[PDB]
Amino acid sequence: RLRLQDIPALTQDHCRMRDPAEVERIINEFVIGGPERMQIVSDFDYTITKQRTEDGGAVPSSFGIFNACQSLPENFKAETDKLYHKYRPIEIDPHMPIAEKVQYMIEWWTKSGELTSGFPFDQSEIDQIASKYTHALRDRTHEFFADLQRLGIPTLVFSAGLGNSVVSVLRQANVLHPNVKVVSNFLQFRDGLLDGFQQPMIHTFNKNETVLNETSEYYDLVHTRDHIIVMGDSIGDADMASGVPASSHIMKIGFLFDHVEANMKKYMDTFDIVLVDDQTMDVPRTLLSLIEKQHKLN
Ligand SMILES: Nc1ccn([C@@H]2O[C@H](CO)[C@@H](O)[C@H]2O)c(=O)n1
Ligand SMILES: [Cl-]
Ligand SMILES: [Mg+2]
């Protein structure tokens, strides 16, 4: 019974939709269903953090947060810079198929894990770096996660980055509530020393059923959660929830900032909602608020 023209955040100029009718229908499904059937799957880097800071200030990735620590050997930032310079162009190569990218991404993550080995490391360094960027989350992220917790909605942060940094940022932002789980590449510690990352490897091209599916540990938390909101700033992010078999309705929300017109067609074909230069969580928040309205009514 909800109409799109009565939902202000969806009517704004930056909100692009290939098919507003299907979006409206999905929203109505969400609200009929209630919070108890809702689940969230969100990318971290430049989805939860800002692509454009209100200030001119730059925001580093999770890996960027790690690599900026002092406890690192003096060779580390050099070697990681070399690796990045090598594999980053490949990661964002439009012409290259994903089935060709995967090998090279495997190379990147492998070499990186092997780089981060043999020296001890303290979480508090990470924390010290991460505390400077709690102010760089999208506007109303705190309120968004507050909503999620209050509604008891399982929220997954699915990241191909460095989980320690992610968790540090989220914790220090006072946003990592009991309902929030993080699946990412986490540091592995052996006998007081680093030993790469803990299996399984999560790269940019397996943020999907190959990693998150019915066999996964997290599935038991959300096997009753058939209404999914997926949030991301990259095309790949759109398939993060492909491994949930009995999902009936999925709202795919994509945040477009870089190369707006070039990527607009792809993003519109990929996401149900495309948000252009939107550094807030006001749209997902809107959805949740409708769902909660219906919840109180019942
Ligand atoms: N060892 C690695 C592996 C990946 N990356 C970059 O971080 C992004 C995930 O947050 C990936 O998309 C990738 O660009 C990195 O900086 N260092
Ligand atoms: Cl990622
Ligand atoms: Mg991202």
187-190 and 193-197 as β-strands: parallel, antiparallel, unpaired?
antiparallel
- On whether both 122 and 179 belong to a single domain, the answer is no
| Cα–Cα nearest to 287, from 56, 1, 2 | 2
Q: How far apart are CA 281 and CA 96, in angstroms?
A: 32
**Cβ contacts of 7-10, under 8 Å, gap ≥ 24:** 7/286, 7/290, 8/286, 9/282, 9/283, 9/286, 10/273, 10/283, 10/286
- Known binding residue 160? Answer is yes
- Known binding residue 130? Answer is no
- On whether both 90 and 219 belong to a single domain, the answer is no
Of the residues 114, 135, 156, the one at which a domain ends? 135
Atom 16, ligand 1: residue with shortest CA distance: 63
Which ligand is the nearest neighbour of the Cα of 158?
2
Cis omega (within 30 of 0) on the bond before 200?
Answer: yes
Give the type of residue at 274: V
Tell me, what DSSP letter sits at residue 198?
Answer: P
- On whether both 174 and 268 belong to a single domain, the answer is yes
Tell me, what DSSP letter sits at residue 73?
Answer: -
Extract the runs of DSSP E, i.e. beta strands, from the chain: 15-16, 38-42, 155-162, 180-185, 187-190, 193-197, 227-232, 249-256, 273-276
- On whether both 28 and 74 belong to a single domain, the answer is no
Question: Which residue matches tokens 């799109």?
Answer: 4
Q: How far apart are CA 294 and CA 282, in angstroms?
A: 18
Q: How far apart are CA 47 and CA 169, in angstroms?
A: 13
Contact between 276 and 260 (Cβ < 8 Å) = yes
Q: How far is CA 8 from CA 200, 260, 283, 293, in A?
A: 42, 23, 9, 16
Q: How far apart are CA 82 and CA 5, in angstroms?
A: 50
CA quadruple 53, 56, 61, 65: dihedral, nearest 10: -120
Q: Which domain holds residue 77?
A: 54-135
Q: Which two tokens stand for residue 219?
A: 């599935």
Contact between 68 and 60 (Cβ < 8 Å) = yes
3-state helix, strand, coil in the chain (%, to 5): 45, 20, 40
| Cα–Cα nearest to 162, from 67, 257, 298 | 67
Of the residues 135, 163, 179, the one at which a domain ends? 135
Q: How far apart are CA 217 and CA 182, in angstroms?
A: 12
Of the residues 101, 135, 169, the one at which a domain ends? 135
Q: How far, in Å, is the centroid of ligand 1 from the Cα of 76?
A: 15
Contact between 13 and 195 (Cβ < 8 Å) = no
Q: How far apart are CA 142 and CA 73, in angstroms?
A: 35
CA quadruple 124, 181, 43, 116: dihedral, nearest 10: 40
Test site for ligand 1: of 47, 59, 61, most ligand atoms within 8 A of the Cβ:
61
- On whether both 48 and 70 belong to a single domain, the answer is no
Which ligand is the nearest neighbour of the Cα of 166?
1
- On whether both 107 and 5 belong to a single domain, the answer is no
- On whether both 128 and 147 belong to a single domain, the answer is no
Q: How far apart are CA 142 and CA 226, in angstroms?
A: 25
Test site for ligand 1: of 159, 204, 206, 235, most ligand atoms within 8 A of the Cβ:
204
- On whether both 169 and 225 belong to a single domain, the answer is yes
| Cα–Cα nearest to 121, from 201, 203, 197 | 197
- If one counts the domains in the chain, the total is 2
- Known binding residue 238? Answer is no
CB-proximal residues (5 Å) to ion ligand 3: 43, 45-47, 233
- On whether both 218 and 291 belong to a single domain, the answer is yes
Q: How far apart are CA 55 and CA 62, in angstroms?
A: 20
- Which residues fall within 8 angstroms of residue 152, CB to CB, at 6 or more apart? 35, 36, 179
- On whether both 276 and 185 belong to a single domain, the answer is yes
CATH number for position 118: 1.10.150.340
- On whether both 26 and 172 belong to a single domain, the answer is yes
- On whether both 246 and 161 belong to a single domain, the answer is yes
Quickly count helices (H) and strands (E) in the chain.
11, 9
Residues serving a catalytic function are: 43, 45
CATH number for position 4: 3.40.50.1000
Which ligand is the nearest neighbour of the Cα of 45?
3
Atom 12, ligand 1: residue with shortest CA distance: 204
Q: How far is CA 160 from CA 70, 100, 122, 223, in A?
A: 23, 18, 21, 23
Ligand 1, CB cutoff 6 Å, lining residues: 45, 61-63, 84, 88, 91, 108-109, 112, 160-161, 204
- Which residues fall within 8 angstroms of residue 171, CB to CB, at 6 or more apart? none
CB-proximal residues (5 Å) to ion ligand 2: 159-160
- Known binding residue 6? Answer is no
Q: How far apart are CA 298 and CA 289, in angstroms?
A: 14
Cα 275-276-278 angle, rounded to 5 deg: 75
Tally of CB atoms within 10 A around 101: 18
